[PDB]
Symmetry: C3
Subunit: 321 residues, 3 copies
């Protein structure tokens, strides 16, 4: 049914519900075999990964590097300071050299269009490691964490409070494909991309789910099963700190926020977390799935790499979504 | 008898003579099997190490990275410039993410208290890769090198001449547990930490060894079997270069120093070495064990990682200490 | 016949035609077994490589790191910012520590004399990863690419147009040993090193090949089978940009250049490429072997490491040179 080998993964907008579910199935399979059964599975033996990072990273860096190596492959960490890209060489040429020396590329960038150039010019899989526009592999870890917590996903309401950024765009490109509703609050002027919203509206209609965009945190939180936030000042946006601290007043997730949420509410934050978006009482709550979520960045990028580079079939029974 | 799996290694003060001897036994075992018998021993297969470095490193970096990989594990080199730590994220949160993505952490830091926070907040082993206060894994290599040279350790007198720094603190936290005496000379005002000295005095009493602190290089060198020094200006102390070059005049180790030492004297320096602390005649002497010492950083960090992460038992006969 | 194990590879001037042919034979063997037959060949299992880079690199970095790891070894990427070299430690001492912790070193430097110090002071193989004077491992990839394209090398004329730099010096140290002629055009004042030219003249005489140095691009291109260029402003020469852009006017390789070349002409450029030295019509021509050339950096550095560190014999039939 699903065929993912050789594909790029630039955004979850290019993937069906069935395809994203397959990647979560594979994540759960690799997690069960390796973390629980202690198996060594050299699925990426004799393969290598080029990791280009234009921005700081703790989770994406660590999960990708230890995950690729745990399956027997070699991860090569490449920064702007060490390679010729931008400085002495074009992206087209860098993309062709990477194609002949590595089996895939994970690139954390500013411009999504750089990932498109890389995908068009390389004949190997290009995986988005975060861009200004989308962060698809984060949402993989998020939905796996919620499937593990709730034992299914269909009908959950996700409540975003915060900026209309890359994380919210990736939730918008995927939530409805799992039959989940989305209620999202951002400050006025900080809404998600109009083009992304338009396509999320279509997905909601196709899947019979609700999509609500608002500027009120408590309207977004009302009846939500999952409260989700992120930093108000994303990487590359630090010049706007003053204006954003003023615009985002009233948007911190607290227990007041949770008081309005469904009784089984949990909390997610992609991390790194600052004190502004969420207080400590929620962040370190027993309902906070923040550190399980961060661990699942590893099992899900492992599943991405296995499905884009091999013909491995999951032995695990498919999870209930 | 000895049980080290799961422990942290922040300082040798937390380890008994028996425990540190076990780590040297394991170092000798892994050195014999791999360097001499040429065996491939994948003891850390399917494991990973997070290496956080806040300071420059050639020996700790290389020994840890090639040693962890030689046992089949994957080392991930993380600097301040690339990860979010300090900048966008707290140490508590970084410690919890590292716990779920790696099997241990080696961290070279400024503040020893950062290693304590890391050890309390992570559920995986934290190994000190050097701090301003201690450098325990260096002394492991030092005592293995001296056991190899002398065929035992008990009753040796170590003569430190130089600064009251992290290397001298690690010798103070361990020498007496091996039945070795310590005679150490520092400039006035540059003495070892009062708290460390107090605990070294107790260890000397418990083990019936001598501890002598002095400001005279020749009193420290008198009758010593091993002359030991290090840079007068440690990393993070470069603002004090002028004051230290003036305070440390007369503290260079030369053949005049060795003339007063025991007849079988040898020399150690943790490296990197500068011309100030020791002259070339001693540093490149046939009695200088500096490069054997630096090689043993690899076999001993391999033994640290194996004992904190596995249940491997040494096949080698225990060395005479 | 050929015995290369334990040798350094600082320049192709120290290698006979037979020895360089053996390295190309081994490159073709490892390429056939791994790229075509899909074999996993752990020839460097239990080995490590220290990679010291003083300059930016995409191809040398990637080919060396993924190639060393593809054969089961561990590559350790060391920059000036992270290790003590230059700053707190001498090259002699760094060379001795690297000898006891790694099995070989690849070093991309400014000064060729730093590679000589490293080779004299270390007891492990030192491989040149590019210096201001030579880039031997690039020419290995170049001649393998041309052997694959033409099915032999003897009698080919290589036509260099550009600067008298490290790439042209490596061609001068090797072309005649394969029975290939060299016609090279540089601007006046930008000629190859007098000492290198003198030795290339001797090699041409010993092998009965022609060597022509000129300042005219079309004289160099006339009847040449391979047009070769590189940047006019090498790394470390950016202060001379103004003077070089003026001196090199008229030296861009275009189809006018190729109109004068042999009918079977191809094009090489070591990369990174800029618009100045060659136009797009030649660079992206079907006759341009630029990206095959860049891929062969990987199979040839793999062969270098295997021949300097093991006793592996090629199973492949020797290529026709
Ligand atoms: C993982 C960090 C996500 C955040 N929105 C950013 O782009 O900085
Ligand atoms: C390994 C270097 C040791 C020195 N005391 C320092 O802290 O810089
Ligand atoms: C691989 C780059 C070669 C160029 N001549 C340089 O030295 O910068």
């Amino acid at each position: 049914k699903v065929q993912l080998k050789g594909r790029d993964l630039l955004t979850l907008k290019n993937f069906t519900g069935e395809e994203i579910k397959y990647m979560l199935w594979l994540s759960a399979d690799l997690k069960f075999r390796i973390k629980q059964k202690g198996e060594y599975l050299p699925l990426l033996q004799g393969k290598s990964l080029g990791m280009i990072f234009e921005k700081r990273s703790t989770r994406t860096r660590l999960s990708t590097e230890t995950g690729f190596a745990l399956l027997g492959g070699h991860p090569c960490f490449l920064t702007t300071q060490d390679i010729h890209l931008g400085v002495n060489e074009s992206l087209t040429d860098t993309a062709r050299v990477l194609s002949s020396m590595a089996d895939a590329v994970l690139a954390r960038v500013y411009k999504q269009s750089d990932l498109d150039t890389l995908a068009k010019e390389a004949s190997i899989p290009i995986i988005n490691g975060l861009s200004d526009l989308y962060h698809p592999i984060q949402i993989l870890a998020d939905y796996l964490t919620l499937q593990e917590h709730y034992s299914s996903l269909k009908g959950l309401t996700l409540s975003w409070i915060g900026d209309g950024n890359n994380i919210l765009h990736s939730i918008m490109m995927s939530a409805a494909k799992f039959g989940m509703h989305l209620q999202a609050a951002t400050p006025k002027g900080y809404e998600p991309d109009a083009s992304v919203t338009k396509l999320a509206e279509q997905y909601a209609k196709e899947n019979g789910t609700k999509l609500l965009l608002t500027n009120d945190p408590l309207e977004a939180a009302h009846g939500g099963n999952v409260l989700i936030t992120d930093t108000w000042i994303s990487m590359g946006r630090e010049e706007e700190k003053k204006k954003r601290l003023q615009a985002f007043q009233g948007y911190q997730v607290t227990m007041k926020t949770a008081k309005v949420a469904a009784s089984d509410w949990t909390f997610l934050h992609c991390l790194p977390r600052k004190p502004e978006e969420v207080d400590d009482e929620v962040f370190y709550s027993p309902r906070s799935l923040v550190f399980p979520e961060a661990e699942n960045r590893k099992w899900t990028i492992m599943a991405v790499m296995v499905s884009l580079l091999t013909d491995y079939s999951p032995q695990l029974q498919k999870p209930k979504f």
